[PDB]
Amino acid sequence: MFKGIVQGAGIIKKISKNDDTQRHGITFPKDILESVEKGTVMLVNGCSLTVVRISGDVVYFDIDQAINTTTFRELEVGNKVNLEVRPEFGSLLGKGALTGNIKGVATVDNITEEEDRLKVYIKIPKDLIENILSEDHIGINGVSHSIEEISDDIIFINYPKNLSITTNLGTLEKGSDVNVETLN
Ligand SMILES: Cc1cc2nc3c(=O)[nH]c(=O)nc-3n(C[C@H](O)[C@H](O)[C@H](O)CO)c2cc1C
Numbered sequence: 001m002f003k004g005i006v007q008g009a010g011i012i013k014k015i016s017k018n019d020d021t022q023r024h025g026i027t028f029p030k031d032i033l034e035s036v037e038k039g040t041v042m043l044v045n046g047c048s049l050t051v052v053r054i055s056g057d058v059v060y061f062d063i064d065q066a067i068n069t070t071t072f073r074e075l076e077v078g079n080k081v082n083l084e085v086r087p088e089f090g091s092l093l094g095k096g097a098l099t100g101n102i103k104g105v106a107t108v109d110n111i112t113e114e115e116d117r118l119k120v121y122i123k124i125p126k127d128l129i130e131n132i133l134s135e136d137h138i139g140i141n142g143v144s145h146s147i148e149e150i151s152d153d154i155i156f157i158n159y160p161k162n163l164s165i166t167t168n169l170g171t172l173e174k175g176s177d178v179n180v181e182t183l184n
Helices: 030-034
Strands: 008-017 022-027 041-044 047-055 058-063 080-084 104-114 117-123 137-140 143-146 149-151 154-160 177-182
Touching: 008 030, 008 058, 137 154, 143 154
Parallel strands: none
Antiparallel strands: 008 022, 008 080, 022 058, 041 047, 041 080, 047 058, 104 117, 104 177, 117 154, 137 143, 137 177, 149 154
């Protein structure tokens, strides 16, 4: 499993629509690109996916098993995805560790940037699914962080603002769909 610390951003270059599957070609930054190969299983927006092909800096994935419980179906060419390759020589996670099994999609209710914090409010739909506890960490697009507060069906996560920079958290707006991994 994975730390839930995003190591870089990919940009979707190509999408093949195959109805109950899609193939996404993602441009990878050079440091992550050279750390992966065919058959690498890594997190893309917090979801475990297997590399099917690499051509130049474009890394390809098929989304099939994951197509009904993640955002991939509705993403577009040019969108930015979070990337995380498994730890090289191990880790103690303990433990916002992520497994890569996304529980389902949720939707950004509100964002506020203040006081060096990115405050994200995420509305949890009723049929997701189990948990969610304010003492626990949660994965949002592969970023693992403690929950700040839960009010009704809205979870408030108060991120340091520089994760606005190093992950796609800073592309989120009201109505953005996200992959949630509850923990657990
Ligand atoms: C080893 C492993 C590899 C996986 N590879 C894929 C993949 O390439 N495509 C896919 O749609 N789901 C894949 N999944 C399943 C996916 O992570 C899971 O359906 C979603 O997280 C559910 O929301 C994989 C899961 C595991 C454990």
